[PDB]
Design an enzyme around this catalytic site. Structure first.
Site, mmCIF file in Angstrom:
data_model
loop_
_atom_site.group_PDB
_atom_site.id
_atom_site.type_symbol
_atom_site.label_atom_id
_atom_site.label_comp_id
_atom_site.label_asym_id
_atom_site.label_seq_id
_atom_site.Cartn_x
_atom_site.Cartn_y
_atom_site.Cartn_z
ATOM 1 N N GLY A 19 0.779 -1.241 0.000
ATOM 2 C CA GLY A 19 0.000 0.000 0.000
ATOM 3 C C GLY A 19 0.808 1.288 0.000
ATOM 4 O O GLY A 19 2.033 1.274 0.189
ATOM 5 N N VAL A 20 0.127 2.416 -0.191
ATOM 6 C CA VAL A 20 -1.343 2.465 -0.183
ATOM 7 C C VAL A 20 -1.979 1.917 -1.461
ATOM 8 O O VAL A 20 -1.471 2.114 -2.546
ATOM 9 C CB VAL A 20 -1.805 3.917 0.086
ATOM 10 C CG1 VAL A 20 -3.314 3.996 0.172
ATOM 11 C CG2 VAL A 20 -1.180 4.418 1.391
ATOM 12 N N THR A 79 -4.718 -1.696 -11.732
ATOM 13 C CA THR A 79 -5.056 -3.100 -12.005
ATOM 14 C C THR A 79 -6.515 -3.417 -11.797
ATOM 15 O O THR A 79 -7.319 -2.588 -11.288
ATOM 16 C CB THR A 79 -4.245 -4.128 -11.165
ATOM 17 O OG1 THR A 79 -4.670 -4.104 -9.790
ATOM 18 C CG2 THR A 79 -2.800 -3.859 -11.247
ATOM 19 N N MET A 82 -10.567 -6.542 -7.207
ATOM 20 C CA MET A 82 -10.962 -7.872 -6.736
ATOM 21 C C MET A 82 -11.724 -7.664 -5.419
ATOM 22 O O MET A 82 -11.137 -7.414 -4.366
ATOM 23 C CB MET A 82 -9.749 -8.764 -6.556
ATOM 24 C CG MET A 82 -8.965 -8.976 -7.834
ATOM 25 S SD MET A 82 -9.732 -9.999 -9.049
ATOM 26 C CE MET A 82 -9.570 -11.570 -8.282
ATOM 27 N N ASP A 126 7.226 -15.014 -6.392
ATOM 28 C CA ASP A 126 6.752 -14.906 -5.034
ATOM 29 C C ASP A 126 5.356 -15.446 -4.922
ATOM 30 O O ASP A 126 4.480 -14.839 -4.292
ATOM 31 C CB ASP A 126 6.774 -13.446 -4.521
ATOM 32 C CG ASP A 126 6.866 -13.391 -3.027
ATOM 33 O OD1 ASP A 126 7.020 -14.432 -2.373
ATOM 34 O OD2 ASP A 126 6.712 -12.270 -2.526
HETATM 35 C C1 LIG Z 1 -3.136 -10.771 2.100
HETATM 36 C C2 LIG Z 1 -2.575 -9.725 1.438
HETATM 37 C C3 LIG Z 1 -3.220 -8.368 1.274
HETATM 38 O O1 LIG Z 1 -3.954 -8.005 2.217
HETATM 39 N N1 LIG Z 1 -3.006 -7.668 0.087
HETATM 40 C C4 LIG Z 1 -3.614 -6.494 -0.388
HETATM 41 C C5 LIG Z 1 -4.272 -5.603 0.464
HETATM 42 C C6 LIG Z 1 -4.943 -4.476 -0.056
HETATM 43 C C7 LIG Z 1 -4.996 -4.239 -1.426
HETATM 44 C C8 LIG Z 1 -4.342 -5.065 -2.328
HETATM 45 N N2 LIG Z 1 -4.541 -4.960 -3.702
HETATM 46 C C9 LIG Z 1 -5.797 -5.179 -4.262
HETATM 47 N N3 LIG Z 1 -6.931 -5.348 -3.576
HETATM 48 C C10 LIG Z 1 -8.073 -5.508 -4.270
HETATM 49 N N4 LIG Z 1 -9.204 -5.699 -3.518
HETATM 50 C C11 LIG Z 1 -9.359 -5.636 -2.152
HETATM 51 C C12 LIG Z 1 -10.675 -5.739 -1.753
HETATM 52 C C13 LIG Z 1 -11.072 -5.686 -0.439
HETATM 53 C C14 LIG Z 1 -10.113 -5.562 0.519
HETATM 54 O O2 LIG Z 1 -10.597 -5.532 1.804
HETATM 55 C C15 LIG Z 1 -10.130 -4.471 2.606
HETATM 56 C C16 LIG Z 1 -8.910 -5.038 3.296
HETATM 57 O O3 LIG Z 1 -9.310 -5.381 4.623
HETATM 58 C C17 LIG Z 1 -10.734 -5.542 4.735
HETATM 59 C C18 LIG Z 1 -8.776 -5.449 0.180
HETATM 60 C C19 LIG Z 1 -8.393 -5.510 -1.170
HETATM 61 N N5 LIG Z 1 -8.175 -5.576 -5.601
HETATM 62 C C20 LIG Z 1 -7.066 -5.448 -6.355
HETATM 63 C C21 LIG Z 1 -5.885 -5.210 -5.729
HETATM 64 F F1 LIG Z 1 -4.797 -5.043 -6.507
HETATM 65 C C22 LIG Z 1 -3.686 -6.216 -1.777
#
Ligand SMILES: CCC(=O)Nc1cccc(Nc2nc(Nc3ccc(OCCOC)cc3)ncc2F)c1
EC number: 2.7.10.2
Length: 252
Positions: A19-20, A79, A82, A126
């Site tokens: 993040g962010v 991107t 999801m 990874d």
């Molecule tokens: C386990 C690892 C991890 O947390 N990785 C991580 C965290 C945050 C954002 C990204 N990237 C992306 N996220 C989404 N959707 C996403 C949806 C809901 C969500 O819920 C809120 C978090 O807590 C409720 C978090 C992410 N779509 C594409 C990304 F590229 C990756």
């Protein structure tokens, strides 16, 4: 702007994801995730050259790269969005009360993505549950493929002996990681080697010891994940073979 460049004036920011990383819309309509890259964290010119190649990777089970915003600080990676978030966290939510056929489908989703990357001679580098995402339909997709190359925790628990001993990375180190990911899926998101440190895990592995069967994995599923952990890299399956093994299990 080139075909790999998005104009940030086309983005509307809607919510923080972690993040962010933010959820937003592009040109008012289209959902996107917007990764803001902190200054100094990335080899940005190398990444931007690679983003041009990532633009042409396209598979239903790969999180799609839409473009990059490069003309300012910080840069953004745009991107596919999801909605159900990171796989690791999803696995850990006990409310889902997952059936094993749902776990096996997760494994197949990832294996299809990885078979595609393999066909393009592209290493993830990874692969782990923390780098997979879940959409609103429950489909798992693989994200951040190749990205670690541009970062200025090493994944000891997802690494084969020849990586830990000699830094020998190959298709077969992605295979080994995929077997550990299957273990993470069938274990409902437990940390691999949960009672060990990284240093102890590396010893355990190099001495030829392994993770053992999650309770939710049948013998046939365990044999597939275990095949990814052969001491000899060349005796590990390909992603194509793994996909055929997973489909055979679904059929039985
Ligand atoms: C386990 C690892 C991890 O947390 N990785 C991580 C965290 C945050 C954002 C990204 N990237 C992306 N996220 C989404 N959707 C996403 C949806 C809901 C969500 O819920 C809120 C978090 O807590 C409720 C978090 C992410 N779509 C594409 C990304 F590229 C990756």
């Amino acid at each position: 702007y080139g075909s790999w460049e998005i104009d940030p004036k086309d983005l509307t920011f809607l919510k923080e994801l972690g993040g962010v990383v933010k959820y937003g819309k592009w040109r008012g309509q289209y959902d996107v995730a917007i990764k803001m890259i902190k200054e100094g964290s990335m080899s940005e010119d190398e990444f931007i050259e690679e983003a041009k190649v990532m633009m042409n990777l396209s598979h239903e089970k790969l999180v799609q790269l839409y473009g990059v915003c490069t003309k300012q600080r910080p840069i953004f990676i745009i991107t596919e969005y999801m909605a159900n978030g990171c796989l690791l966290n999803y696995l850990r939510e006990m409310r889902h009360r997952f059936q094993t056929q749902q776990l096996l489908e997760m494994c197949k989703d990832v294996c299809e993505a990885m078979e595609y990357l393999e066909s393009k001679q592209f290493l993830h580098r990874d692969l782990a549950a923390r780098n997979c995402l879940v959409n609103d339909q429950g489909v798992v997709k693989v994200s951040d493929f190749g990205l670690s190359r541009y970062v200025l925790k090493f994944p000891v628990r997802w690494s084969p002996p020849e990586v830990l001993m000699y830094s020998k990375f190959s298709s077969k180190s992605d295979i080994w990681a995929f077997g550990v990911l299957m273990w993470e899926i069938y274990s409902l998101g437990k940390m691999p080697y949960e009672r060990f440190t990284n240093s102890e895990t590396a010893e355990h592995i190099a001495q030829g010891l392994r993770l053992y069967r999650p309770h939710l994995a049948s013998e046939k599923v365990y044999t597939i994940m275990y095949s990814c952990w052969h001491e000899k890299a060349d005796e590990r399956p390909t992603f194509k073979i793994l996909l055929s093994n997973i489909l055979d299990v679904m059929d039985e």
